[PDB]
Assembly symmetry: D3
Homo-oligomer: 243 residues x 6
């Protein structure tokens, strides 16, 4: 009995799961683990069992956008997942403080999607699990990797238009740290399904300055590597609790 | 230079574009053409230039979900595309009429997403271009493939919960024929960007009966084949004009 | 029995109905038909059975405003009407392309009313029927009357204030062609009551330039006549199929 | 210059105006006054200068519907009107207390329309003038005509459907006394334009019991006569004050 | 048994109740009456029975804010109160007309709170009881104390931020006269619970000019005294009837 | 000068502040500290400087309700406060797990208020600070006091009615642990003003079971005492960071 989109089975899902947007990232991550086992690759959902520091945990891609990652999260959550951490890139909403290559560990997010709203009233908060957040921060510390912490704007609109103003500036003034497209959806589904969520992101630019060239098409190896070591370090530590 | 996510160039975009959800479908579609030229494959976005009936039109996958597909559509719309037709699967909202395997050509959709709303007020209608819609029907007729016509509910939620009621039943009563996850976004973006759009779908089940086993993990072969034939034919005809 | 406001009987309703706003316009139309038969006149609703090219179809006024025209359309749709085509005036939202006298056939509208929302969720599209739209266009073609095609903004507010800004500018940018006050309501009511709908309009000005005198109290004589011909033609053709 | 819809000049507008919905009603009232002067009749808007008790004031019909009567009310408010009292019919939302033929003078109203919201935020109250309200109740008293007082639900939807529940039950529980289609609109435009407003209504049924036949196509003759005298009386008193 | 927050029994509640925000204002009021009886003091809720002009009635403080006062109004309304009149301070939204020290008797309010919305749909009006409104204006007249009349904006936000614009300017244009923090909540709860409400306020500054020093930490003494006399006077006339 | 409502000077505000609902409660708290200094008592806002474990910090009452507490929180945040911890009571939304007397430390909340929405869009999350959250949890551990952790629903409605359904059952299903009236307001204002917030609460009942007598008028003594020690110890620890 395979999951509609993940195409893996309930028994293949581990208590801890690391999710990334791009299926290509999963290939690049598994290779940095001690060992790995490919499980499946359907549509944009690539699943690979990872082995790191004596721990077992999956790495599944969820694709771009909230609606699509929700399919992934729901299938994981409703079939055994206990801890889901997202690792990806984001834009800066505090250009004078957080810049390209920087890593931010988010504890909550703005719900600028639709799926979470079709799941629960807008007043409900999109908040991650403290423990996942704390473990991600401690691993960063142990790897002597400096990081930022804050709220992420999870917006379904990457390319804004000139009719309806973007709420990015409002949220910047509101002290939101960064902007991406999945975290809020992950957090809300997680709390509704009693699954611990977290999120660590690396900055690839600032949407306020895209027209100025404030955007990297590719991340600096060293930096991306650091964020991955943190994420993997965290999953390993969190998985130990369910071994 | 390449487009951020598609990874192709402005010159590589044909005036007509056939968009699908699964990147694997693009492969299964390219082979059935006279000849093709693989262009790129980034994340869930595979771009192949198709050759059919002496015409040139691209076949691009947009992934699952509106936020992710809007990324695809915006990059196409803002870089040359004059016509975009979505071909994918959907669910039936009229079980006593539309069953598994049936094909439906839609001309309008329910905007149960968030990205379109971040673009223009919700009162704005998500409607396809008439000619595209008509062209799709004439091809279905020439090929002698009976099809339905109607409104598709484009919802960002695939797996509903037990707290906030789904609006599928209401829309069913409102006479909406089908339910999927991207059309409404395509139409709205098309209208704003002045790009003609249309959509044709093949039913894979009925969400009101998933619990009773009404769902196909695999689309009906001959029906899928006919739909793709209709789509390719329609794309070929429309492409002709622009050439 | 008689319908509450139209004061006509169910048996007096023809499958095809032509609806106008001003009841004084229903008299001007009946006189250009081969023959007619006055049915009733209550409040702002004047009903007449028109005879044209061997076909019989009613011509009913619906008054200004969505709420009032809804009362008229509900009684028509719930008592026999199968097709309803609205013919009236509108303002241009594209002053550089669409000017006074011009005629526009719309296939969708912006739901800036309240009745449609009291009837169905705001995400539902206000879209007219394909055949009706096609018919109107072909009839315009045969008469060699050049017409525009696009979305209409149906707003309950004719006279804007200075507190809450008008959304017309946004819709103009979103590529909506014109603006009037009843099309969206007709469309939604029809989709709900399985009644084919459509609309054709003649421009009497541009709300963006009213203060500059850009507005006609009287419609362009010949242009109005052409629209009426197109309308009567489409009714005749549609009434034939139903008979 | 004539108003766009009313087709009367600015100098033809008296400080006090009595508005009814049916243009036929304006004729049946003018004859009950000492004398009168027919001013104009365009669309559903018929205007007549009434002479009663040595005082002068217009009687203009507004048609069925919030959007329609708004065009009327705006043209009057922006051109002289200081006081506008609406007298029409309504349904009871309190079947055990308010019944057919009963008269209700309303001080406030539920804004279930769209134009008011396009004018100011929904939080703003639809409330009439205390003095107008007061003069109406006193004219009723001097005529020994018992009347009810309360809130009117002004809803753009006359014929409800079975998808989106009607809020009428809710408002009945909230103690709204009556239901009609124009009062809230008049009150909001009025406070915004600094025009005093009020309304008197006669009950023709109870929408909760329409299916049982709790409705009258024709109002109780004498009861209708009383309400109109109260209205004409109130109008005369206020007009005097404005003399 | 004692009400949860007021800590008084149902038998200690009189048909007429005068509410104020500051519990300190209660002590300053009782000594201006012929006599009094301290009832209770819990949290910000101070109740005292007042004896004025041979009539009995309570004076209860409700604290700052719509949610806190709703708790107060509900315990009073669900346990006997028939009339509740609020007497407090407010800011001016019409600095060209209403100044510090001026008194305003309000008949309706803008519902910029949340409690009233969790009680009834937003379209419902926040309107006071006419008799109460009239009784206050007449007492004012008998005391030769000029007063203003108008709509009050009851907003939950006292200190605006720079991200989301304040709606006060919009409401000033809409002609709202004054702004405070509990009137609309009292009115709505009142209408729902069949309790008659009213409100008399004294201006302590204008929020549009706080940055220019337009604010009084202490209200104009003589003026505050006049308003308190108008209130006690009104409470006496109203309590008289019930007795 | 003094803060408008709290009546204390900017210089009298310490970096860490302990806020509570009942002013009567701050007097009961200062007495358990080493020493204290009364600062002011205006309306429901009582301010006292507390000296505890070699540290200093204020304890201020904010009264019942979000609009009321916001006044308190704004005056504190805009004048030097760096950390604000709310210690209050709450109702349980999980009667089978969390019971009366139990203590719950919250890190996020549902924004069922108006003020926070008047400061920023609803999608913004109401989340507390991690350090504060962890500090409170660590202090609980050291004192060997078991506590629950979870989301609190902050709702402006204490007494619901029968027209509009309460959302409490929904949030119970969405896994929110408890319900109170001011935490979401504090969190939002904190994030906007760059002030670290937190919240610890003691259960006094279950709103789902009030009708069955599931409510304590008096908080469980030893449990209340335990919670206060946790709050005082947390404030002391956090204040150390600013010494
Ligand atoms: O500046 C940005 N805005 C919005 N999303 C992203 C992302 C993340 N990368 C993906 C889009 O490239 C998507 O998954 C999003 O979550 C990186 N930078 C940005
Ligand atoms: O019953 C259905 N509900 C929602 N989406 C789909 C789909 C389409 N397939 C994809 C999800 O498998 C997604 O792209 C969606 O548009 C098929 N059947 C259904
Ligand atoms: O510029 C315009 N704005 C809004 N409505 C109209 C109309 C149509 N005419 C009527 C109002 O005169 C109304 O029925 C509306 O649909 C013409 N021009 C305009
Ligand atoms: O039961 C009712 N519901 C809604 N409107 C009305 C009316 C009034 N009469 C008109 C519709 O016949 C319309 O102007 C409306 O305001 C009478 N009875 C009812
Ligand atoms: O300018 C103002 N804005 C908002 N509220 C008030 C008030 C009233 N005083 C209290 C706040 O100080 C609160 O009860 C409010 O209703 C006085 N002046 C103003
Ligand atoms: O069951 C409950 N619902 C809502 N608030 C509270 C409270 C807290 N107590 C106060 C209301 O009594 C208010 O400050 C609120 O935050 C205790 N129990 C409940």
């Amino acid at each position: 009995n395979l999951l509609r989109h993940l195409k893996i089975s309930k028994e293949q899902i581990t208590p801890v799961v690391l999710v990334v947007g791009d299926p290509g990232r999963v290939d690049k991550i598994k290779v940095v683990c001690d060992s790995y086992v490919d499980l499946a690759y359907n549509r944009e959902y690539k699943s690979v069992e990872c082995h790191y520091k004596g721990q077992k945990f999956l790495c599944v891609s969820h694709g771009v956008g909230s609606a699509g990652c929700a399919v992934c999260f729901e299938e994981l959550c409703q079939n055994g997942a206990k801890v889901i951490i997202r690792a990806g890139s984001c834009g800066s909403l505090q250009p004078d403080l957080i810049k390209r290559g920087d890593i931010c560990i988010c504890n909550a997010a703005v719900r600028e999607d639709r799926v979470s709203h079709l799941l629960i009233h807008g007043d409900f908060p999109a908040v991650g699990d403290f423990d996942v957040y704390d473990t991600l921060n401690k691993c960063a510390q142990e790897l002597n990797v400096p990081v930022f912490n804050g709220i992420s704007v999870s917006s379904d609109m990457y390319y804004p238009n000139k009719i309806i103003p973007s709420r990015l500036e409002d949220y910047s003034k509101a002290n939101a740290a960064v902007v991406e497209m999945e975290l809020a959806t992950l957090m809300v589904i997680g709390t509704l399904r009693k699954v611990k969520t977290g999120g660590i992101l690396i900055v690839d630019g600032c949407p306020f300055k895209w027209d100025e060239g404030d955007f990297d098409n590719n991340l600096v190896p060293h930096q991306l590597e650091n964020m991955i070591k943190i994420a993997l370090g965290a999953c390993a530590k969190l998985a130990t609790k369910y071994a």
